[PDB]
Design a protein around this ligand. Structure first.
Ligand code: HEM
Ligand code: FW6
Ligand code: FW6
Length: 405
């Protein structure tokens, strides 16, 4: 009953609280986290657009202050990473991003769609063959696929899938979790390991070359592009976290939300050409990220409310995606929604998601082939899906399902 019901870290059903915030206090200061909480769509899209007033430099600063022990651990481990791009500000961001998109060329996207599809069918069949005819859409399908894709694109061993998810859970907990000074210690070590592997791969590209993003970036350095080895390594640190966890969550939510609405799963079975629009509606209705942070570089206003220089802003895009002023019946999941692409789950402006297409790519491929091979798929029960507490990432821990077999 406090802060209009908003619980910053509970990710199981924040949408009722989002709804009353939009009506009662659209720009609310939450002392429990230190942020101005913004919930209406215009307000949020405007804040994204004016990057010159609202810096993103705190997007990767931890919500809870790093404790003495994690600070010593990461310092003694040589951890010098902050942010590949998402918390970089111009001129550094502009300069580094343009070099990144000259290696993130969308031909690589569409060139190896077939090996994505061949890998889904592999995973779908192994799920359909086991003692119990019950599966988990996260571990059985959505855990591997985007991870292997991003490891193949950058040049990591695809045998290290469990190391990179262990490093992802750490980064997602260290930075947006409600961690104590003890609880940072195990993730502190993981981030040190993760940063040292990012640096090990960059030195590898100098020495032995390759055929991949890591090689291409160093290859652009050798050809005169203004990007250092600390920035090459920071670009891997960004892509080897953001490049799969959000996409794992999107795939898991595709089956979570479509199986909660069997009528639209049934329409997806009828017509697999509706699948792309379904993904657009899942992204609006259940985004992987519900909140993203910014920092006021000067005294300003959001929606009439005065905000001091240096104040932190939390843009609740999960709330914006249901604003009745932009989405009629915003709280209903409807894959036929005409303007679902107006959603802000990939952001807006100079930090827009670099791999939005690569994520939607694998989301559509997973629906296309799971609806075909397993058209009778459905949830086990109604109350069997929990979400890890976080400020930004709303990750379902499991999507338990069964089928006709
Ligand atoms: C699967 C669903 C995904 C969602 C919902 C998502 C969401 C976001 C959001 C909210 C931002 C910040 C936008 C802003 O501040 O303006 C962002 C930026 C970014 N995303 Fe994604 N993302 C997803 C997948 C991916 C994938 C697959 C990749 C790479 C393969 C990726 C890489 C990045 C990078 C590098 C940035 C920072 C770009 C910059 O700061 O210029 N993300 N994403
Ligand atoms: C416990 C309910 C309550 C009572 C008084 C103030 C208040 O304000 P808030 O906690 O800052 O939202 C809440
Ligand atoms: C999903 C957007 C995102 C999230 C976390 C890190 C990141 O990359 P980085 O901040 O540049 O290291 C991107």
């Amino acid at each position: 009953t406090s802060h209009h019901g908003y619980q910053p870290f509970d990710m199981h059903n924040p949408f009722p609280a989002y709804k009353e915030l939009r009506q009662e206090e659209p720009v609310m200061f939450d002392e429990r986290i230190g942020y101005w909480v913004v919930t209406k769509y215009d307000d949020i899209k405007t804040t994204f657009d004016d990057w010159e007033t609202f810096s993103s430099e705190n997007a990767q600063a931890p919500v809870r202050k790093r404790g003495p022990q994690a600070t010593q651990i990461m310092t003694d481990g040589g951890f010098t990473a902050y942010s590949g791009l998402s918390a970089r500000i111009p001129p550094e961001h502009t300069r580094i991003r343009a070099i990144a998109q000259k290696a993130f060329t969308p031909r690589r996207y569409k060139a190896l769609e077939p090996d994505i599809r061949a890998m889904v069918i592999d995973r779908v069949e192994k799920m359909l063959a086991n003692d119990q005819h019950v599966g988990d859409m996260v571990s059985d399908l959505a855990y591997d696929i985007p991870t292997i894709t991003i490891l193949t694109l950058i040049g990591a061993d695809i045998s290290m899938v469990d190391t990179y998810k262990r490093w992802s859970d750490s980064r997602a907990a260290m930075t947006w979790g409600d961690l104590s000074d003890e609880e940072q210690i195990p993730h502190a070590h993981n981030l040190v390991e993760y940063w040292q592997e990012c640096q090990r791969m960059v030195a590898d590209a100098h020495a032995h070359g390759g055929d991949n993003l890591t090689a291409d970036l160093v290859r652009a350095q050798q050809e005169g592009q203004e990007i250092t080895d600390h920035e090459i390594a920071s670009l891997l640190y960004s892509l080897l976290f953001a490049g799969h966890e959000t996409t794992t969550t999107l795939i898991s939510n595709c089956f979570r939300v479509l199986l909660d609405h069997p009528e639209q799963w049934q329409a997806i079975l009828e017509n697999p050409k509706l699948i792309p629009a379904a993904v657009d509606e899942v992204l609006r209705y259940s985004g992987s990220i519900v909140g993203w942070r910014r920092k006021a570089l000067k005294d300003t206003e959001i929606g009439g409310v005065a905000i001091k220089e240096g104040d932190g802003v939390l843009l609740l895009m999960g709330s914006a995606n249901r604003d009745e002023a932009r989405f009629e019946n915003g709280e209903e999941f409807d894959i036929s929604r005409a303007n679902a692409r107006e959603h802000l789950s990939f952001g807006f402006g100079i930090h827009y998601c670099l791999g939005n297409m690569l994520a939607k790519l694998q989301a559509k491929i997973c629906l296309e082939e799971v609806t075909r091979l397993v058209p009778s798929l459905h949830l086990v029960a109604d109350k069997a899906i929990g979400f890890r507490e976080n400020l930004s990432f709303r990750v379902p821990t499991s999507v338990p399902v069964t089928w006709n077999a």
